Design a protein around this nucleic acid. Sequence first.
RNA 1: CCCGGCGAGGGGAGUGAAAAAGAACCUGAAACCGUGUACGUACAAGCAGUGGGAGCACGCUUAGGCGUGUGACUGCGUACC
RNA 2: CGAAGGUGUGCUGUGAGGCAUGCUGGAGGUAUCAGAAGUGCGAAUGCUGACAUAAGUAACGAUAAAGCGGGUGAAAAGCCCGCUCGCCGGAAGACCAAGGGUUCCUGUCCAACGUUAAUCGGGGCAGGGUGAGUCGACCCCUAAGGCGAGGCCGAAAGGCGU
Lengths: 102, 46, 55, 110
Amino acid sequence: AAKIRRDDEVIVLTGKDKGKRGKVKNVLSSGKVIVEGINLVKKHQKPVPALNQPGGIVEKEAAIQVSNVAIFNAATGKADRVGFRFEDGKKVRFFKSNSETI
Amino acid sequence: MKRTFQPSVLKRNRSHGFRARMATKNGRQVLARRRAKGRARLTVSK
Amino acid sequence: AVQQNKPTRSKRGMRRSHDALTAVTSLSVDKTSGEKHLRHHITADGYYRGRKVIA
Amino acid sequence: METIAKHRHARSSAQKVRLVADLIRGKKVSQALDILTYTNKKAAVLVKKVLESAIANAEHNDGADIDDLKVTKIFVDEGPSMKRIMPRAKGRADRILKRTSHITVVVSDR
RNA sequence: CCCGGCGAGGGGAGUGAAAAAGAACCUGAAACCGUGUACGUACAAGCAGUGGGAGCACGCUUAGGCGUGUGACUGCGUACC
RNA sequence: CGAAGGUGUGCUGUGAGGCAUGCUGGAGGUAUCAGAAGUGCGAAUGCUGACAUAAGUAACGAUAAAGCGGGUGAAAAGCCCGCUCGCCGGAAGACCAAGGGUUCCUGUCCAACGUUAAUCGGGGCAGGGUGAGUCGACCCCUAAGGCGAGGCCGAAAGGCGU
C-alpha cells in the first residue's frame, strides 16, 4: 500500500518551503504530489482567441517529490512515520511515535 | 544510346519472384538466408 | 598549369589592395522641393531643375 | 552609451559584405544613410536595415537623440556553410559551398 | 513593448543559483577568418634564424636601476625523413 | 570557503619532468610502498572528420528574338491582362501501348529545391477529383516452351518423359 494519500495533512521536510503545511490535492504515478499553497511558480501564458481566454502572468503549483513531505501528527505537533497492521479483518495505518490509528 | 536496364514487370516476376524461388531447392536456401539476416523485403514481388 | 607552392595570406592581401569601393562625392538639392538627388537625374517625386515632369 | 544590433545567418559571403561595411566606419548616421542609399550592391540593403534597427533601439530603450549618434563599431564574421553536389563531365561529382555571415553594428553618442 | 515584409533576425522587460545554461542549448582545445592598440616597413637581393646592437613605447623605482613589446644597421648561415 | 578538464604567470632539476598561484568550470580526485599493461607518433601515394589555396578566377547546357502600356506587390527583364514581332507545322500538333504512380484541379506560403530575382512552379501544407451488360482485364481455345500421377534412369542431391 501507499503511506501518503489524497486529502492528507503534511509538513514539508526539504527545500525552500521547509516547515510549511498543506493538504494533498492529487497523486501522480511518477512519485510526486501536488500540495495546496506549496511550491509556486510564475508562468507566462499566451492568449488564445478560442475558449475566450486572454494571456498573462499566472501563479500556480508545481509537483514535489513524495519523500520530501511527511504526515503531520496534530496531537504532538510534529512530523511522523507510518506503519501498517490488521485490526478486525482489514488493513490500517498507524503512527509510530505513539502507536495510534489514523 | 541504349543502356542495360529495360524494365518489364512480367519478366521481373518470372525471373526473381516468390514462386520461382519456392520452385527449386536452392531458391529456398536464398529465402532461408534472407530470413536469418532479417530483411524487411524478401523478394521483388509487391 | 598549376602552382608548385601554396601562396601566403600576405600575398592575398597584396593582390586585394586594389579592390576598395568609392563613395559618391556629394548630392544635389532641387531648387523648388528641396530634395536630394544624383546630379543630372530626376528626384524620387518627379522633379528636375525646379519643374515637375512626371505625375 | 553604446547600442548594438545584429543580423545572424545572412545569405552572402563575408568577403562581399566587408566591401560595403568599410564605407561607413566612423561616420555620422545621417551621412552613412545617405551613402548607403546610392550604392548599387546587394549587401547595402542588408547593412542599411541593421543600421536602422540599431538607431531605433537607441531611441526606444536608452533615450538617445538621433542628431548626436555615430557609427562607433562595425564588423562581419563568417557563419556555417551548406554543402551541395554538382555533376561534371564523365561521371565525376564536385562539391559546392554556400556561405553565410553574421553582421554587427554599434552606435554611440560619444 | 520596439525596428522589420502581419518575415528571417535582433534589442529591452520577466523566470532562474547561472541565459556567452535560449532549444544550431554541459565543458568548449587546434587548424582557419576578423576588429582595436604599440613598434617596424616604399634605393632594397637568397632555408628567414643565430651572435652583436641604436632608437621608440610602456610598468616598478631605493631617482640607483631593472623588467616587458618592437627592432634600423652588421659577422656567420643551402629544410626534415 | 570550489574536484577533474581549459588558458596565463612565477620558480625549480643534467634530461624525460615537477611545484605554487590568477581567470574560466561546476562534481569529483587520490599521497606512500607494491602489483598488471590496448603505455608515449611527423612521415607508411596510412584511416575518419573539419578547414585552407588557386579566386571572387572558369562557367550559368543548342545563335528560334524580342519591344512597350496597365495590374498586384516591401520589391517586377522573367508572374497576370492587352497590342505588335519572331520560330515549328509528316512536327517542336493530336491520341495511345510499355514504364512511372498523384506529378491532375482549387486555396494558401517562399526557409530549403529552381545553375540569377521570384508575387511563379512538376517545391511545402490542406481540401477535392477516376460512375460501364456493349471499351479492356478476368473468362472459353490453343503456338514456341514450362510443369508433370503412375513410369524409365541415376552414390545422395536429382535427369527425362505418358
